[PDB]
Design a protein around this ligand. Structure first.
Ligand code: NA
Ligand code: NA
Lengths: 68, 132, 68, 132, 132, 67, 132, 66
């Protein structure tokens, strides 16, 4: 079996000035269009997604053991 | 800007039961909630001593990544110092961690979200709310 | 539409996939930080997105209530 | 560089009505506009006492994120004190929030943008414009 | 760090009367006191509408130089906005400048020093002290 | 940490912008204590203000806060 | 760079007794010493509950001004949480603030300078040092 | 290749002869306390503090850590 190694097409891109830069713990992002404008959002900051997701065990912090 | 500081109790309660009423508050207030690093310490401790440390740390990182963690700083410390003296003059008994959280919140003009407003009440200059 | 973030020449940047690419006439843009999101607007049209959505309830400050 | 300070009235008008003409003016003058924190206060108040505070705050956040909010500092305080005194001599009556805004714009040599220039013209050394 | 925010009332009280009890207070707490720029505005208006603008301004400016003047910022404005709405649903009337000063102090977790503590007790999450 | 130097005929200490003085502070008091010196901004004591000039008697008989 | 975190004990000791042996150390290690904000909190409480608060606060201020007060942050909080679980397991008892101070030191790779040294020994991966 | 410029002016205190420093003080450590600044001789930063500044006797006889 044999095939070709090609270069992808250049992508439209936008630079973000330092003043309005995302945090760096942010590295993956979702984008939606509204008219001639595009809205950029960090992915997986959904509260709903987290609430619906994994649970903790049932023992977890049944006692806080904060010093009397 | 930041508006609410979630105390350790409301966090435990939220993480264990993932209740609809809180979910609705969280959405309604996305971006305006933080916790003190003092509460983060308590949560890490809760997971490490936990039966499923791996699993529990994981849910906690999901929580922390969506809310800010404020560093407990000198201004936070100064208010806690004051709060401890105010309270001891009145024989009002409040836990050490709760006292730091109370001081932290007061230093920043933050509202304490808790499910036991009954003990944060004893502190002055402090607003509390019960998100159940 | 998901996407990725990259540093380009000591500055944050954002790919815009074809399904979300800006029109050809948009040559310069203005990036606005609204909380955790960033809004990419064609230079000269910064307000179009805000004017078009984002309605306040109808009661909002019918009364300013400045003393005097 | 900042050229204009939007008073509270113009903001309320714009926010409630989203007028086409104002959109054109804003787009044109983007980067030259600001409000005083005095005006922020009123807008926060407007939302806080409204039917839908978080909804309304979100809209205000959108608006504010595109402009600068100037802190009301000693210089603004000093001009407002003067202005208040100059006005009493004239007997020209102005609201207190408007006085602070007028003082703030004059301290920074900004043009007050408003929806009724009547009030602010009774004020010395102050240029106004009607963008309604 | 700053501890006390002197409202407009003790300022007038202190400036008009130079009371000894207050002198002792300032000596004891020098370095830890400030006023909001809102109060500065009032003081300046006070002097400006005086019968001895010249002399009265000079006294005020000697009072200020020994005291910190905090800028009225976005946090102070947000708290004020919240407070004005909090008081509306209670029918508790506080003045506009008093409200801004309250908002300001709360945002910074400062203790409002006043003599009219009655007007400030209406306000939540705020601590007052009578220094008269 | 800085280096002692001279300026226009006499001794000088530089203040690292970290521990700088407010732009207000134009003149300064100096006290000696052992090998250490203490700097304090001049005219920030309260007695000198209380004993000092007083305001005209009418000053803010009316605060004129609206409402 | 910083090398030392003074614990709370060595601070109460030093401040009360002004021991010249400690005066030597400090002068030598000037620029390499810090305390956790947690310890600052204790010292503040000390002054606040004492007979002469303003006086004691001023001594504490001169001490604190000479060193770094580190904000108790997420890493410090995480180290403390792990440490609490580690000691709880091994039934080694250590006080809550000492736990946070220990956690803070370890997260920064700093040496803990104590009075007693005995309690901090039970903490893994933490270097101590007696300066009394 | 780069252009030569001028550094920013730093803040400095004239130190009167009545209160000048010993000749063996060429390194100095400047501490801020309130609106007050303290000039100490390098390696002697803690002397002034150990000297004055006593705390009332009752000061933390008990730490009261729970
Ligand atoms: Na408890
Ligand atoms: Na009006």
């Amino acid at each position: 079996h044999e095939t070709t190694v090609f270069l992808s097409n250049r992508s439209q891109a936008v630079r973000l000035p330092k003043a309005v830069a995302l945090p760096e713990n942010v590295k993956r992002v979702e984008v939606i269009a509204v008219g001639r404008t595009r809205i950029i959002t960090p992915a997986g900051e959904t509260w709903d997604e987290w609430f619906d997701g994994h649970s903790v065990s049932t023992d977890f912090m049944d006692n806080r053991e904060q010093p009397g | 800007m930041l508006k609410f500081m979630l105390d350790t109790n409301i966090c435990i309660f939220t993480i264990k039961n993932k209740p609809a009423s809180v979910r609705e508050r969280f959405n309604l207030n996305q971006g305006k909630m933080c916790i003190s690093s003092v509460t983060l310490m308590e949560l890490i401790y809760g997971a490490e001593k936990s039966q499923m440390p791996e699993r529990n740390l994981a849910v906690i990182e999901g929580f922390v990544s969506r809310i800010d963690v404020l560093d407990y700083d000198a201004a936070a410390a100064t208010h806690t110092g004051q709060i401890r003296a105010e309270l001891a003059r009145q024989g009002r008994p409040v836990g050490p961690f709760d006292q730091m959280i109370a001081g932290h919140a007061r230093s920043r003009g933050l509202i304490i979200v808790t499910n036991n407003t009954r003990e944060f009440e004893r502190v002055g200059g402090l607003r509390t709310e019960d998100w159940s």
